[PDB]
Amino acid sequence: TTPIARYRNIGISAHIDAGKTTTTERILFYTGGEVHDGAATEQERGITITSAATTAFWSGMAKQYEPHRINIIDTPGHVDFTIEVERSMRVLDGAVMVYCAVGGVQPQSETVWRQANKYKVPRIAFVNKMDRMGANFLKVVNQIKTRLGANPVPLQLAIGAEEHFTGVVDLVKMKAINWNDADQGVTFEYEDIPADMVELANEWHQNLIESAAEASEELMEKYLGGEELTEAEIKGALRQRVLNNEIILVTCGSAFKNKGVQAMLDAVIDYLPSPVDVPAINGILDDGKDTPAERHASDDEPFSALAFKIATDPFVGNLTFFRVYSGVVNSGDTVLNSVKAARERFGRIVQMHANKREEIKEVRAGDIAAAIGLKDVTTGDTLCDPDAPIILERMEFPEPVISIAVEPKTKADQEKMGLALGRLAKEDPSFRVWTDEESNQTIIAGMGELHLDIIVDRMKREFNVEANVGKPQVAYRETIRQKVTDVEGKHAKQSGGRGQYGHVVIDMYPLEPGSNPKGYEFINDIKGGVIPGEYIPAVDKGIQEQLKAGPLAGYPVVDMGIRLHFGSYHDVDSSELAFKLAASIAFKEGFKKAKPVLLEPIMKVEVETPEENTGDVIGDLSRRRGMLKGQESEVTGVKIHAEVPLSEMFGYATQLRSLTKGRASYTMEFLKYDEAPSNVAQAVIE
Amino acid sequence: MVTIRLARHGAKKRPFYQVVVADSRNARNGRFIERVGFFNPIASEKEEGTRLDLDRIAHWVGQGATISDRVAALIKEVNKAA
Amino acid sequence: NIKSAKKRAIQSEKARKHNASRRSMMRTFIKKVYAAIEAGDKAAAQKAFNEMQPIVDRQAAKGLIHKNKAARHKANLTAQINKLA
Amino acid sequence: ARYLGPKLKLSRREGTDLFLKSGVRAIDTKCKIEQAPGQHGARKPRLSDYGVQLREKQKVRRIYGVLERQFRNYYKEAARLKGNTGENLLALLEGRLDNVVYRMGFGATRAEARQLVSHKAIMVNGRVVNIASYQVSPNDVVSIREKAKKQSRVKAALELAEQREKPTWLEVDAGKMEGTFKRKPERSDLSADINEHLIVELYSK
RNA sequence: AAUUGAAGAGUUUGAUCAUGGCUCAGAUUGAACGCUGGCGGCAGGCCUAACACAUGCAAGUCGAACGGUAACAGGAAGAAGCUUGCUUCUUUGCUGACGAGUGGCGGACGGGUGAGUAAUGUCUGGGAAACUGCCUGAUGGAGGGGGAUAACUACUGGAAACGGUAGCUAAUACCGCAUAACGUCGCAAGACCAAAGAGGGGGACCUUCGGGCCUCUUGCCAUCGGAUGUGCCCAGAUGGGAUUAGCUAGUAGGUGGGGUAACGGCUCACCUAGGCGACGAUCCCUAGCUGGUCUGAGAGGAUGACCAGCCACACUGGAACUGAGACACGGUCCAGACUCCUACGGGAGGCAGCAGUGGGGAAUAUUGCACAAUGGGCGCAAGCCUGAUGCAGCCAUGCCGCGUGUAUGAAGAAGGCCUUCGGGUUGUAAAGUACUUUCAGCGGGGAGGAAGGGAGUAAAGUUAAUACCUUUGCUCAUUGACGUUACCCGCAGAAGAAGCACCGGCUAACUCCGUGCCAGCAGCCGCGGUAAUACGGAGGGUGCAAGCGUUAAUCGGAAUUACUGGGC
Numbered sequence A: 001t002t003p004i005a006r007y008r009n010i011g012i013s014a015h016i017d018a019g020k021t022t023t024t025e026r027i028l029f030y031t032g033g034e035v036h037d038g039a040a041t042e043q044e045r046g047i048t049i050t051s052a053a054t055t056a057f058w059s060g061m062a063k064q065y066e067p068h069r070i071n072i073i074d075t076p077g078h079v080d081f082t083i084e085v086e087r088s089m090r091v092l093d094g095a096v097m098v099y100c101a102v103g104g105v106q107p108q109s110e111t112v113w114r115q116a117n118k119y120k121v122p123r124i125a126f127v128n129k130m131d132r133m134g135a136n137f138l139k140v141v142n143q144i145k146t147r148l149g150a151n152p153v154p155l156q157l158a159i160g161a162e163e164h165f166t167g168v169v170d171l172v173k174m175k176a177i178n179w180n181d182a183d184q185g186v187t188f189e190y191e192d193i194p195a196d197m198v199e200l201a202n203e204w205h206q207n208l209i210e211s212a213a214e215a216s217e218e219l220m221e222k223y224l225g226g227e228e229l230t231e232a233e234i235k236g237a238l239r240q241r242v243l244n245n246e247i248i249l250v251t252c253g254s255a256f257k258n259k260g261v262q263a264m265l266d267a268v269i270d271y272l273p274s275p276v277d278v279p280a281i282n283g284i285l286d287d288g289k290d291t292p293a294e295r296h297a298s299d300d301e302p303f304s305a306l307a308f309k310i311a312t313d314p315f316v317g318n319l320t321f322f323r324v325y326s327g328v329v330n331s332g333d334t335v336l337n338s339v340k341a342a343r344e345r346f347g348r349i350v351q352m353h354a355n356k357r358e359e360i361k362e363v364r365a366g367d368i369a370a371a372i373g374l375k376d377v378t379t380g381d382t383l384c385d386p387d388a389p390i391i392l393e394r395m396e397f398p399e400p401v402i403s404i405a406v407e408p409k410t411k412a413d414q415e416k417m418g419l420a421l422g423r424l425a426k427e428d429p430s431f432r433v434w435t436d437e438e439s440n441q442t443i444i445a446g447m448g449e450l451h452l453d454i455i456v457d458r459m460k461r462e463f464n465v466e467a468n469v470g471k472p473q474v475a476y477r478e479t480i481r482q483k484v485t486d487v488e489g490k491h492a493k494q495s496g497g498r499g500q501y502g503h504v505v506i507d508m509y510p511l512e513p514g515s516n517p518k519g520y521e522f523i524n525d526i527k528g529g530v531i532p533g534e535y536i537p538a539v540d541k542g543i544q545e546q547l548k549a550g551p552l553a554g555y556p557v558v559d560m561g562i563r564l565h566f567g568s569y570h571d572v573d574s575s576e577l578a579f580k581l582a583a584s585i586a587f588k589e590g591f592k593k594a595k596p597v598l599l600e601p602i603m604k605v606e607v608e609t610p611e612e613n614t615g616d617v618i619g620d621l622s623r624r625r626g627m628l629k630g631q632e633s634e635v636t637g638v639k640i641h642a643e644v645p646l647s648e649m650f651g652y653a654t655q656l657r658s659l660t661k662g663r664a665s666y667t668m669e670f671l672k673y674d675e676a677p678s679n680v681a682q683a684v685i686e
Numbered sequence B: 001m002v003t004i005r006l007a008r009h010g011a012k013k014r015p016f017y018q019v020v021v022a023d024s025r026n027a028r029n030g031r032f033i034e035r036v037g038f039f040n041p042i043a044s045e046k047e048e049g050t051r052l053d054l055d056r057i058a059h060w061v062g063q064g065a066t067i068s069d070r071v072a073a074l075i076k077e078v079n080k081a082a
Numbered sequence C: 001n002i003k004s005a006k007k008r009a010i011q012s013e014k015a016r017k018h019n020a021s022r023r024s025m026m027r028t029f030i031k032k033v034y035a036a037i038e039a040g041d042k043a044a045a046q047k048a049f050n051e052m053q054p055i056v057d058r059q060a061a062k063g064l065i066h067k068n069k070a071a072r073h074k075a076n077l078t079a080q081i082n083k084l085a
Numbered sequence D: 001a002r003y004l005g006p007k008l009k010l011s012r013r014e015g016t017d018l019f020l021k022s023g024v025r026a027i028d029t030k031c032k033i034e035q036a037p038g039q040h041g042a043r044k045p046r047l048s049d050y051g052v053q054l055r056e057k058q059k060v061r062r063i064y065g066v067l068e069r070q071f072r073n074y075y076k077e078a079a080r081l082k083g084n085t086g087e088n089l090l091a092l093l094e095g096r097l098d099n100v101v102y103r104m105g106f107g108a109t110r111a112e113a114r115q116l117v118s119h120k121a122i123m124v125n126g127r128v129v130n131i132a133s134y135q136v137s138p139n140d141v142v143s144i145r146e147k148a149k150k151q152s153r154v155k156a157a158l159e160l161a162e163q164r165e166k167p168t169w170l171e172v173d174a175g176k177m178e179g180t181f182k183r184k185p186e187r188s189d190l191s192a193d194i195n196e197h198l199i200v201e202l203y204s205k
Numbered sequence E: 001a002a003u004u005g006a007a008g009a010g011u012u013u014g015a016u017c018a019u020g021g022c023u024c025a026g027a028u029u030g031a032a033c034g035c036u037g038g039c040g041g042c043a044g045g046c047c048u049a050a051c052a053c054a055u056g057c058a059a060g061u062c063g064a065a066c067g068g069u070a071a072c073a074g075g076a077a078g079a080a081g082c083u084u085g086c087u088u089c090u091u092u093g094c095u096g097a098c099g100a101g102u103g104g105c106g107g108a109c110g111g112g113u114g115a116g117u118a119a120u121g122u123c124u125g126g127g128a129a130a131c132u133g134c135c136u137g138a139u140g141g142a143g144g145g146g147g148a149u150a151a152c153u154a155c156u157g158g159a160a161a162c163g164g165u166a167g168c169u170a171a172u173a174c175c176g177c178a179u180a181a182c183g184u185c186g187c188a189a190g191a192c193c194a195a196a197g198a199g200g201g202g203g204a205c206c207u208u209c210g211g212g213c214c215u216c217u218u219g220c221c222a223u224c225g226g227a228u229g230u231g232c233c234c235a236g237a238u239g240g241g242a243u244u245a246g247c248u249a250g251u252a253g254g255u256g257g258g259g260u261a262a263c264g265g266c267u268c269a270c271c272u273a274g275g276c277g278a279c280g281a282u283c284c285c286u287a288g289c290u291g292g293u294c295u296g297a298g299a300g301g302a303u304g305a306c307c308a309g310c311c312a313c314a315c316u317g318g319a320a321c322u323g324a325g326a327c328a329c330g331g332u333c334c335a336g337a338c339u340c341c342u343a344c345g346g347g348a349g350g351c352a353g354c355a356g357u358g359g360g361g362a363a364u365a366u367u368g369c370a371c372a373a374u375g376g377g378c379g380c381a382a383g384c385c386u387g388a389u390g391c392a393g394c395c396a397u398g399c400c401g402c403g404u405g406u407a408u409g410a411a412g413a414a415g416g417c418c419u420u421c422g423g424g425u426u427g428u429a430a431a432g433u434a435c436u437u438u439c440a441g442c443g444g445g446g447a448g449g450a451a452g453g454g455a456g457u458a459a460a461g462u463u464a465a466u467a468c469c470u471u472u473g474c475u476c477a478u479u480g481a482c483g484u485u486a487c488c489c490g491c492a493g494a495a496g497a498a499g500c501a502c503c504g505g506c507u508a509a510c511u512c513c514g515u516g517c518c519a520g521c522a523g524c525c526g527c528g529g530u531a532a533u534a535c536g537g538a539g540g541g542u543g544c545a546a547g548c549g550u551u552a553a554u555c556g557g558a559a560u561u562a563c564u565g566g567g568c
Helices: A020-031 A034-040 A043-049 A082-090 A109-118 A137-146 A198-211 A217-225 A231-243 A261-270 A411-422 A449-462 A533-547 A576-593 A614-623 A652-658 A678-684 B054-061 B069-077 C007-039 C042-062 C069-078 D008-014 D049-064 D068-080 D085-095 D110-118 D153-159 D197-201
Strands: A007-014 A068-073 A095-099 A123-127 A152-154 A156-159 A167-170 A175-179 A188-191 A248-252 A281-284 A292-295 A304-311 A319-326 A328-330 A334-337 A342-352 A357-360 A362-364 A368-373 A382-384 A403-405 A433-435 A442-445 A477-480 A488-493 A500-510 A520-524 A560-568 A596-608 A627-634 A637-645 A665-675 B002-008 B017-023
Touching (some): A007 A020, A007 A082, A007 A109, A007 A261, A020 A034, A020 A068, A020 A095, A043 A449, A068 A261, A082 A095, A082 A109, A082 A304, A095 A109, A123 A261, A137 A152, A137 A156, A137 A248, A156 A198, A198 A231, A231 A248, A248 A261, A319 A328, A328 A342, A411 A442, A488 A576, A533 A576, A560 A576, A596 A614, A596 A678, A614 A627, A614 A652, A652 A665, B002 B069, B017 B054, C007 C042, C007 C069, C042 C069, D049 D068, D049 D197, D068 D085, D085 D197, D110 D153
Parallel strands (some): A007 A068, A007 A095, A095 A123, A123 A248, A520 A560
Antiparallel strands (some): A156 A167, A167 A175, A175 A188, A304 A382, A319 A368, A328 A362, A334 A342, A342 A357, A342 A368, A403 A442, A433 A442, A477 A596, A488 A500, A500 A560, A596 A665, A627 A637, B002 B017
8 A cells, every 4th residue: 555656745836926826825735535525515724625735536446547646745835835845755756737728928937946956856747827818828838938948848739728718638648638618627539639739739749759758868769760668668758758857748738628637647647757767866964074875775775864944733733744754753762853953752753644544553665644742852953763873954044124013902911922933943944033122022033925925823812913004214323523612411419418529521423434343442542630540431321322322213332432631530430430420421412512413224135136126126116215336137137236325125035926926036135334314314303 | 139249458569368258249459348367579589378178168168259350269269178 | 423332222222121111011910910909809809900910020030020029919919819809 | 079278278268177288297387377367367256156066067178178968968978877977977977988988198289089989090899980979888998999099199198197096996017008998987086176966056956 | 665856147437335237057859950970779751831642552351141153162963075085165153262243341440730719618526307339237039921133144325434215133231010028109098219230050750861959159129227438507717908998689687389319509499688897898910738848955937749538620611311419531512722534424532540642931851560468349250351450671869888998118219389499298099919709791600579270189068969059278380571670609800980169358278470450259248550369270188978069949047927926
């Protein structure tokens, strides 16, 4: 019942709104008496439905034929989930790239493709919209060639066009099928190739036999004579060529109209690779100096798995999904977590099915499931129960550029918000949690609106947390622009049943720039005991403490050099306490006296935006009151460099993704602090 | 029914079976009829280690009380008359 | 509830219908006894008694009405057929 | 569960040698005994009854190097047993294994005699003991193992052993380096400057 | 020899005595919190919401009860995988066993909880009207027949769970008949009631070669007892409030019928008109009781975690069945609340069982290993089941031990603090120089929990038998969760390991600087408005030590509800 060669871990990947969900739901229907069950049967729902792995069966014949189990990997809770696609590729063997036949430019559809090549994972294309208007198989095969350079080979040709789409022709076996129904697909019949299409069928057929003879002199000789290289080999030749990332078999149909889907499943079996058709996963031994070794998928060899997803369960609890690459993981055994250093107790194994849970005794190599128990195991960690020194891997890092302040309306929400982050950080280790330096709030950073949009929903509900879901907030820095003309510091009070006295004069001037944090600088010009040295330290602390709060908005004072030139001591006082205070008032007076001004952080921005949305990103930056430095050309795109107030960056993240469908991306780094804009300088005081 | 059992009133790692005639139904270290001797597995090799009163056992054994495995073993281990 | 011994339910229920019927036919006979005594029929009193005595002791020996209860009726009834007869 | 801190600092506080530095020199001196409890050693220790009542039991502790948590038990133990609670309390303390190594000469000093106990460098009626809370009983034969025998400290320890008062309730040797706890020390032996009725009151109130 | 042992102080006032409160010194606790934290042993570990619950598991077992072929493990006439000796199932139930099913038994025992209940309870001491599976003593029956059903076969409603007709077949399943005392009804006479057979082995002989028969063992049925368990009766004892004083009409009693294992208003009809109540009914509030536990000199006070007995409960309420025993904890039916499954017609489920989750709270943990041990259920036994239990993981919660070095070491370093500038103090502490290695780390050796079983033998008991079986010896090969066990030995280096409170008096321990009724300290008295031992820091010292403080709690102090042992 558990054949490694008949396993098919897949993942539906395509541009957003291209048809990933629809195609997945249909594959679950055809593959899934549970059939008539669901037949006769929005964010929360869209989230619940999708489950880790959804198994099912498909075999041309119940007996005397080859049956196959198709594990449809998904969950990617986000558009063209690069983070969920990447990890799913490493954890797997194959994928299916769905293209929007009507979708003209389908620019971000390139994002999901880059991930495929990123993890060198074989894939098959599927033009999902043949029924729709503008539904053009050719347009999909031409753009895939020019823009994606994926070297597509035509396997299927559409019968009829748009509305008149009634059938599909299998070009490999030279035979077609007709669908008597426009829905529910309850009528399919093996029909011969019609007339007005026979000629076109023979052309591509010899075009297909031509492609399956390239990388081989033997195949070459037969191609010349026209001799058909054995079929079992034409499927094996195309299979060998698709597994070695040299060609991409293309299929067609309409997931919605229920057409060509079944032929698509056959393609998955006939061409898509299994856990064995992919190079042994690599790793590093813990000897410091590398020693990389390949992990052959042998069930009897020493086990080695990779946890790729921690998941809180309203029932069983913490669940750590894994991908057994070697050996076997048994229930009731002890495994060694080498990334850390301790034995973990494995309580039970469990596979996630479409509707129910199944308790099993074991999970051999090449298989996947959930593991209850394991308290200290996180994502990325590697486990090895046979003692085979574990190894590790990680060759990337996710970006943010988006942070959201979150003042839980109460302390009760502050605590459950910390759990909503630390518990969801194990799953999505891309974001980061902090505390605003000049505020004291919770800041969550991500990749997009919907990302934090659903995260917020997961907080207020799942963790019950009503809060003033923040948007932009403010900060600021301050400094003077001109030299002080005098400013003294007199502190004389009979507060203490004893007199208190302190007298200091100081020349504080705006300070020069510098790489180091030395924005502050003190100098003692006291020439002749005017001020006793026993209290110079006092005045230094008095000043220091006051810099912590400015007059404009009570924020730390920086970039200033303070000098002391004159003072004196008196009849009873003269104490570290006396002159400490004597320094406080002197600073407050000076800062307010030397023309105060705000200092906002300026960021260095690099915007990649197609080659076509380039001019659009420039204009947008110019309007954001930024200052263009110059644009760099990268590939068929452009990188725009410029300075723009983190202040005024306000929403560029999304405004930029809006004019690019996400085509564009950007990175933001701190550069320097500059003097604010008059208009903003007035709004700060309060 | 009634049966002679060993009350595990010892300690962790170092137990001490306290034989006693009690009703099989009742818990092991629970309610009992009457105490009759004892048993110590970690009595080492010195002197006393298993002082079992037989004059009281044979009383219930023939009265209607059954015998356990380990108990019957102790009865056949410490001989009978010598 | 899925717990193997689920059979103990249908097993005890199957016996319920059994004991219910047997313990039922036992009453009628006992009924036709006090009835004859209630009216005053001396003859029918004993006649109906020699008909219950066998079944009363029978069911009593079975298990659905052991001892006492069995000797209860007979003892009382026998002390009722000799009051004014 | 030890002191580790300056030993003499304690003896100079009680105004009497606690045999903490009985290694070689005697009668203390050459240190700063007596007039040097602290910065105000000149200050005349004028305390009430409570003080002198505590300065007694606290002094006994510094000697055998015992702590309250453990000392408290000895009191409740000496009070449980039959006889003069004061005398009993001294018995248990005088029965300590580490103690049954000092008066024998196996250790130049109590702290040292106990140092050998921990490192299981001594045995009893056969088995080896490593703890100091070993309430040694009569007829026992405490000694040192064949390993690490007649080493360093043991030599010097047995050196000034005869120059000392030397008990009489035990049988110490030199060749085999063995010992035998004949009987428990009575109130007569070992005393002089030490009270019991005082160390009891403090734990009686 | 065996409950032989009792302490005080601070504060009213200018001062004193007396009276009378508060507070501290002593122990203790399922603690929590704050700081810190090295190891081992043992023990304990949801006190609030009996608040709601995912999943796994917690009660299965017997073929030596039976009908039987479905799975996989052997044999099998005869057929075949065929590469003509290498060898596969068509089936067959011949049998080692076994899904489902029928039947027997345990599911009423263990385990969990403090909800209720102030009296159908508990504790203590007795009583008499009964029942009592398994385990046992004694004495007899164990004869002879019949009618069905599950499984399964055919058909069929189903999504699943789970059924609907027609068939047919066996038994330690069920029901008659015969038999009938020391039994039951009864003064007596008489009358009346039970059963089940199934296995091991076997010599002349023999049959419808499966057996009859002989014999043995294990069960069935009846009666009288032992033992155990249970129900019931009765007296005493078992919290607070009077700002609750009358309460009760099945309530008290008689009789008759009925009723349960048994007595009884347990119930009903009738007659009687009493019954409970200052020695505290009723009502309200609160709470399980006890052995004991904590404290105390005792007397008492407080308390009822863990261990053990008892009662009651098992989401709430109610009722009933099966059975020796439950008005049942993983059983059932109905109602209420709630959750889950569903193709929408229709069903299922309850952790105050183990771990665990949501939620609450100051706070209480792993969804572990094994039936090796003990014990329980079934069985002849072998075995099987077993979240009881035996252990492990987590936490210093607590108790009890241990280590974090041991000696030597000077006119007494430097530095820091104080200083009448002489000096003192930190200070044998550090450095330096010898020596040692428990615990942690590493590498090896290696107790006990193991007694019994399983096959060969020598008898001894039964028998027609040396075969079978039971028991007792002998002999040989073997059955460990813990565990890298406990323990022991070897290697290296002192190498990896100390913080915490307090220092005015109470109460062991004080100088300086900083602060100046400000900032702050505080259990009580009482400190700070210029030399503050009380505030903050530092020096030093003291009290403790993997614990140390704080707070909370009961008792003692408290003769401060004073019976022992006080006043107006």
